[PDB]
């Protein structure tokens, strides 16, 4: 299979572009506690499809601006 990192949408005010905050629950090297850490990206999309506050699948792809080197595969569980 191909890559598909899950992540929740933060904003869409960019036109054919989005900002996604991927969540990851990795532990601290020293102390052992599992911390709720963020991986903030930008992603491409043909037209402003996704809105705000919803889970999204994302693929590693060709660079298509400065930053923003990720493509939207599809939406899963759309906004309320």
């Amino acid at each position: 299979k191909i890559r598909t990192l899950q992540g929740r949408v933060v904003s869409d005010k960019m036109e054919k572009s989005i900002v996604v905050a991927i969540e990851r629950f990795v532990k601290h090297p020293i102390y052992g506690k599992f911390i709720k850490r963020t991986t903030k990206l930008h992603v491409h999309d043909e037209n402003n499809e996704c809105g705000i506050g919803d889970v999204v699948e994302i693929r590693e792809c060709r660079p298509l601006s400065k930053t923003k080197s990720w493509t939207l595969v599809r939406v899963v569980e759309k906004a309320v």
Partner: peptide, 10 residues
């Protein structure tokens, strides 16, 4: 307090 040390290390 372990969470206190994450927020401010030794």
């Amino acid at each position: 307090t372990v969470n206190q040390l994450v927020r401010k290390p030794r």
